[PDB]
C-alpha cells in the first residue's frame, strides 16, 4: 500500500581507520551525511560525505584479509576507504552501516 516508512533504530557507529588514523564512522542525526571523525571523537568530522553525492559503495568480500568499505563520491572521482577494526565485530559493523546506507540510497 501507500505507507512510506523511514528507519528508526539507533544510527550505527563503527570503529574504523581512515588514512591510517583511528576514528568513528557514522551518519549525521538527519541521516543526510556519512561522517568520519578521528578519535577521541571530540571535534568535527574530517570526512563528511552527502548521501546525495554517493555514486557507489563497495566492500571487501567476507574472509578477506581486511574488512573495508569503499565509497565513491560524485566528481577520477573522489573515493574514501574505511577499514573496520573492531577485533570481533568488524564485519558485522560494516554490514550494519552498509545495510542502512543502501536502504537510504535506494530511497
Ligand atoms: Cl570478513
Ligand atoms: Cs558499534
Ligand atoms: Cs577479516
PDB file of C-alpha atoms and ligand atoms in Angstrom:
ATOM      1  CA  UNK A   1       0.000   0.000   0.000  1.00  0.00           C
ATOM      2  CA  UNK A   2       0.860   3.728   0.215  1.00  0.00           C
ATOM      3  CA  UNK A   3       2.567   3.946   3.609  1.00  0.00           C
ATOM      4  CA  UNK A   4       6.127   5.135   3.488  1.00  0.00           C
ATOM      5  CA  UNK A   5       8.473   4.371   6.437  1.00  0.00           C
ATOM      6  CA  UNK A   6      11.939   5.633   7.450  1.00  0.00           C
ATOM      7  CA  UNK A   7      14.494   3.934   9.756  1.00  0.00           C
ATOM      8  CA  UNK A   8      14.007   4.460  13.429  1.00  0.00           C
ATOM      9  CA  UNK A   9      16.728   2.468  15.069  1.00  0.00           C
ATOM     10  CA  UNK A  10      19.936   3.878  16.617  1.00  0.00           C
ATOM     11  CA  UNK A  11      22.371   5.037  13.902  1.00  0.00           C
ATOM     12  CA  UNK A  12      25.345   2.558  13.798  1.00  0.00           C
ATOM     13  CA  UNK A  13      28.792   3.943  14.945  1.00  0.00           C
ATOM     14  CA  UNK A  14      31.758   1.894  13.767  1.00  0.00           C
ATOM     15  CA  UNK A  15      35.408   1.644  14.917  1.00  0.00           C
ATOM     16  CA  UNK A  16      37.232   2.413  11.735  1.00  0.00           C
ATOM     17  CA  UNK A  17      40.557   3.727  10.311  1.00  0.00           C
ATOM     18  CA  UNK A  18      40.671   6.361   7.598  1.00  0.00           C
ATOM     19  CA  UNK A  19      44.155   7.102   6.111  1.00  0.00           C
ATOM     20  CA  UNK A  20      45.657   5.041   8.943  1.00  0.00           C
ATOM     21  CA  UNK A  21      44.117   7.128  11.772  1.00  0.00           C
ATOM     22  CA  UNK A  22      41.581   5.620  14.214  1.00  0.00           C
ATOM     23  CA  UNK A  23      38.130   7.045  14.416  1.00  0.00           C
ATOM     24  CA  UNK A  24      34.395   6.593  14.234  1.00  0.00           C
ATOM     25  CA  UNK A  25      32.302   6.191  11.121  1.00  0.00           C
ATOM     26  CA  UNK A  26      28.628   7.179  11.490  1.00  0.00           C
ATOM     27  CA  UNK A  27      25.829   9.236   9.926  1.00  0.00           C
ATOM     28  CA  UNK A  28      24.588  12.659  10.982  1.00  0.00           C
ATOM     29  CA  UNK A  29      21.349  12.649  13.039  1.00  0.00           C
ATOM     30  CA  UNK A  30      19.393  13.793   9.959  1.00  0.00           C
ATOM     31  CA  UNK A  31      20.874  10.815   8.066  1.00  0.00           C
ATOM     32  CA  UNK A  32      21.935  13.088   5.199  1.00  0.00           C
ATOM     33  CA  UNK A  33      25.789  12.777   5.641  1.00  0.00           C
ATOM     34  CA  UNK A  34      28.237   9.981   6.192  1.00  0.00           C
ATOM     35  CA  UNK A  35      30.787  11.316   8.682  1.00  0.00           C
ATOM     36  CA  UNK A  36      34.151  10.084   9.928  1.00  0.00           C
ATOM     37  CA  UNK A  37      35.766  11.732  12.969  1.00  0.00           C
ATOM     38  CA  UNK A  38      39.225  10.872  14.371  1.00  0.00           C
ATOM     39  CA  UNK A  39      39.468   9.621  17.973  1.00  0.00           C
ATOM     40  CA  UNK A  40      38.838  10.887  20.585  1.00  0.00           C
ATOM     41  CA  UNK A  41      35.869  11.970  18.507  1.00  0.00           C
ATOM     42  CA  UNK A  42      35.657  15.285  20.407  1.00  0.00           C
ATOM     43  CA  UNK A  43      35.988  17.534  17.349  1.00  0.00           C
ATOM     44  CA  UNK A  44      34.382  17.949  13.958  1.00  0.00           C
ATOM     45  CA  UNK A  45      34.448  15.268  11.290  1.00  0.00           C
ATOM     46  CA  UNK A  46      37.352  15.136   8.887  1.00  0.00           C
ATOM     47  CA  UNK A  47      35.209  13.450   6.251  1.00  0.00           C
ATOM     48  CA  UNK A  48      31.637  14.466   5.578  1.00  0.00           C
ATOM     49  CA  UNK A  49      30.016  12.975   2.541  1.00  0.00           C
ATOM     50  CA  UNK A  50      26.462  13.773   1.441  1.00  0.00           C
ATOM     51  CA  UNK A  51      24.445  10.690   0.791  1.00  0.00           C
ATOM     52  CA  UNK A  52      23.043  12.588  -2.275  1.00  0.00           C
ATOM     53  CA  UNK A  53      26.619  12.528  -3.638  1.00  0.00           C
ATOM     54  CA  UNK A  54      27.472   8.885  -3.165  1.00  0.00           C
ATOM     55  CA  UNK A  55      27.584   7.088  -6.504  1.00  0.00           C
ATOM     56  CA  UNK A  56      28.934   3.733  -5.277  1.00  0.00           C
ATOM     57  CA  UNK A  57      29.509   1.569  -2.190  1.00  0.00           C
ATOM     58  CA  UNK A  58      31.755  -1.487  -2.328  1.00  0.00           C
ATOM     59  CA  UNK A  59      33.150  -3.901   0.301  1.00  0.00           C
ATOM     60  CA  UNK A  60      35.931  -6.402   0.635  1.00  0.00           C
ATOM     61  CA  UNK A  61      34.335  -9.903   0.389  1.00  0.00           C
ATOM     62  CA  UNK A  62      33.835 -11.814   3.606  1.00  0.00           C
ATOM     63  CA  UNK A  63      37.014 -13.707   4.534  1.00  0.00           C
ATOM     64  CA  UNK A  64      39.261 -11.045   3.019  1.00  0.00           C
ATOM     65  CA  UNK A  65      42.355 -10.053   4.973  1.00  0.00           C
ATOM     66  CA  UNK A  66      40.776  -6.698   5.814  1.00  0.00           C
ATOM     67  CA  UNK A  67      37.213  -5.577   6.296  1.00  0.00           C
ATOM     68  CA  UNK A  68      36.887  -2.436   4.187  1.00  0.00           C
ATOM     69  CA  UNK A  69      34.058  -0.273   2.877  1.00  0.00           C
ATOM     70  CA  UNK A  70      34.722   1.918  -0.139  1.00  0.00           C
ATOM     71  CA  UNK A  71      32.660   4.984  -1.081  1.00  0.00           C
ATOM     72  CA  UNK A  72      32.776   6.761  -4.381  1.00  0.00           C
ATOM     73  CA  UNK A  73      31.548  10.392  -4.459  1.00  0.00           C
ATOM     74  CA  UNK A  74      30.237  12.333  -7.466  1.00  0.00           C
ATOM     75  CA  UNK A  75      33.138  14.254  -9.252  1.00  0.00           C
ATOM     76  CA  UNK A  76      38.945  10.088 -11.397  1.00  0.00           C
ATOM     77  CA  UNK A  77      36.090  10.501  -8.820  1.00  0.00           C
ATOM     78  CA  UNK A  78      36.791  11.090  -5.091  1.00  0.00           C
ATOM     79  CA  UNK A  79      36.823   7.813  -3.083  1.00  0.00           C
ATOM     80  CA  UNK A  80      37.036   7.011   0.585  1.00  0.00           C
ATOM     81  CA  UNK A  81      38.090   3.731   2.238  1.00  0.00           C
ATOM     82  CA  UNK A  82      37.234   2.870   5.805  1.00  0.00           C
ATOM     83  CA  UNK A  83      38.819  -0.189   7.499  1.00  0.00           C
ATOM     84  CA  UNK A  84      36.696  -1.759  10.208  1.00  0.00           C
ATOM     85  CA  UNK A  85      38.929  -2.594  13.149  1.00  0.00           C
ATOM     86  CA  UNK A  86      36.677  -3.922  15.937  1.00  0.00           C
ATOM     87  CA  UNK A  87      38.533  -7.159  16.949  1.00  0.00           C
ATOM     88  CA  UNK A  88      35.473  -9.414  16.760  1.00  0.00           C
ATOM     89  CA  UNK A  89      32.700  -7.262  15.218  1.00  0.00           C
ATOM     90  CA  UNK A  90      34.439  -5.675  12.206  1.00  0.00           C
ATOM     91  CA  UNK A  91      32.361  -7.431   9.545  1.00  0.00           C
ATOM     92  CA  UNK A  92      29.110  -7.098  11.470  1.00  0.00           C
ATOM     93  CA  UNK A  93      29.719  -3.366  11.839  1.00  0.00           C
ATOM     94  CA  UNK A  94      30.466  -2.981   8.139  1.00  0.00           C
ATOM     95  CA  UNK A  95      27.355  -4.928   7.282  1.00  0.00           C
ATOM     96  CA  UNK A  96      25.202  -2.752   9.512  1.00  0.00           C
ATOM     97  CA  UNK A  97      26.335   0.579   8.175  1.00  0.00           C
ATOM     98  CA  UNK A  98      26.262  -0.899   4.614  1.00  0.00           C
ATOM     99  CA  UNK A  99      22.660  -2.030   5.133  1.00  0.00           C
ATOM    100  CA  UNK A 100      21.490   1.333   6.412  1.00  0.00           C
ATOM    101  CA  UNK A 101      23.309   3.235   3.719  1.00  0.00           C
ATOM    102  CA  UNK A 102      21.982   1.058   0.939  1.00  0.00           C
ATOM    103  CA  UNK A 103      18.413   1.461   2.285  1.00  0.00           C
ATOM    104  CA  UNK A 104      18.893   5.277   2.392  1.00  0.00           C
ATOM    105  CA  UNK A 105      20.486   5.385  -1.011  1.00  0.00           C
ATOM    106  CA  UNK A 106      17.740   3.265  -2.662  1.00  0.00           C
ATOM    107  CA  UNK A 107      15.073   5.761  -1.334  1.00  0.00           C
TER     108      UNK A 107
HETATM  109 CL1  LIG B   1      35.026 -10.953   6.901  1.00  0.00          CL
HETATM  110 CS1  LIG B   2      29.058  -0.413  17.290  1.00  0.00          CS
HETATM  111 CS1  LIG B   3      38.696 -10.326   8.147  1.00  0.00          CS
END
